[PDB]
Every structure is written in C-alpha cells, then in structure tokens.
C-alpha cells in the first residue's frame, strides 16, 4: 500500500507456493474461501467504493509542519534566557524524534521475528544488529537524565563522556 514508505518498512518479496493437490478429494478450505469471498468481500468492497467516491467528491489537504533550526545549548550564554528557551524546545523535539526512530526499528524487529517463523534466530540477524546499534546510541544520549531532564544535563553527560574518552585515548597512546 502507498500509505507508507516501503524503504522505511522493508519486506521480503513474499514468495508463496502453488496449489499441488495430490488426491481427488475436494478440500473444504477452498470452497469456504469462495463462499466467504461472495458473501463478505464483495459487499465490503462495494461499500468502500461508495465511500471512496464520496470522499473524492470532497478533496482537501493537510500539511506536515516544518521547523527551522535554531542555535543549540552549546552556544547559549550562561543567563541568556531566550536562547536557552529556544534550545530547550529544539532539544525536546529532537528527543521525541529519536524516540520515534527507536520505535521504527523495534517495529522492524518484531515484524521480522513474526515473519521468519522457525528460522527467526538466523534470518533476523540484521534487524537485531540495527536495534543493538540504535539502542546503544539512544542509551548513550538519554539514559539516567532523570525526570527533570534538560538539554544542559545532556550536554554535561556528553562532556563527561568525552573527557573519559580523551583520558582513555591519551592513556592508551602513552602506554
């Protein structure tokens, strides 16, 4: 369906076998699906076509809101309240977007596990690896900030992580 992007939500080509009856006994499943089609799918389709033509008679649009980029907390003065307000709002929007990215990857993983069947342990390696990377990045960014989280605390956590990384790199180089 065109309602979603196929690249953002990938799917395998979905190869299905062909009916190969081996006996002369008529299977009840095919007849049941034919009567289901005739008694259910046709009236539902007709009602849908009526509703779709009514919707086509009245077509109107809504838009995705675009947000400009503003200076972040790393270029705000100590007490400049307006810049910190703008940077805090931008950081909160970015936090929400990152949460939704993690949600997309988790949906991919769950769909893979259901789809692959008994061979999910081997056939869902890529989704597991992607989720591992995204989870690691999200945990590095946002974990342990508390309920009163803010952009300043995230910046402090990043600064401490970079200090630790720099110290470890200098210690390893000067080994």
């Amino acid at each position: 369906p065109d309602s979603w992007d196929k690249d953002v939500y990938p799917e395998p080509p979905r190869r299905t076998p062909a009916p190969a009856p081996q006996t002369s006994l008529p299977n009840p499943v095919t007849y049941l699906t034919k009567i289901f089609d005739l008694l259910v799918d046709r009236p539902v389709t007709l009602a849908r076509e009526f509703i779709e033509q009514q919707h086509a008679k009245n077509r109107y649009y809504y838009y995705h809101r675009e947000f400009r980029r503003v200076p972040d907390i790393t270029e705000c003065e100590e007490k400049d309240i307006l810049c910190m307000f703008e940077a805090e709002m931008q950081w909160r929007r970015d936090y929400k977007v990152d949460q939704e990215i993690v949600n997309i990857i988790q949906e991919r993983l769950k769909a893979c596990q259901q789809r692959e069947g008994e061979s999910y342990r081997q056939n869902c390696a890529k989704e597991l690896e992607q989720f591992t990377q995204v989870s690691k990045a999200f945990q590095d960014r946002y974990s342990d900030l508390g309920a009163h989280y803010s952009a300043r605390k995230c910046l402090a956590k990043q600064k401490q992580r970079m200090l630790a990384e720099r110290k470890a790199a200098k210690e390893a180089a000067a080994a």
Binding site: V8, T74, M162
Partner: protein
C-alpha cells in the same frame, strides 16, 4: 465532553514526530549514515578544559 476529548487535535505532535523519524531513517539508510548518533551535540562546538595533569 468525552467526544470533545476524543477528537482533540494533535498538539502533542506524535504523528509529526513519526513523519520526521521516517524521513530521517530513509535519508540515513540511503546514504549509509549509522542511524542515531551517540553524540547529541557535535564535539566541534564544545571546548573541553585541558587537564595537563
């Protein structure tokens, strides 16, 4: 009142965040970027203090 609350417009911006995340994931998978990055702010704009210990 229940009907009014049910149809409250999306000022919390859930679907907006979903669309933004979709576009970001598409772009980063297309160009090979590693999805989410570990650093929230790029280190080019942070001036760490020299320890010199």
């Amino acid at each position: 009142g229940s009907t009014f609350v049910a149809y409250l417009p999306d000022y919390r911006m859930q679907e907006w965040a979903r669309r933004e995340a979709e576009r970001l994931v598409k772009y980063r998978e297309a160009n090979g970027l590693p999805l989410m990055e570990s650093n929230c702010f790029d280190p080019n704009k942070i001036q760490l203090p020299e320890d010199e210990d």
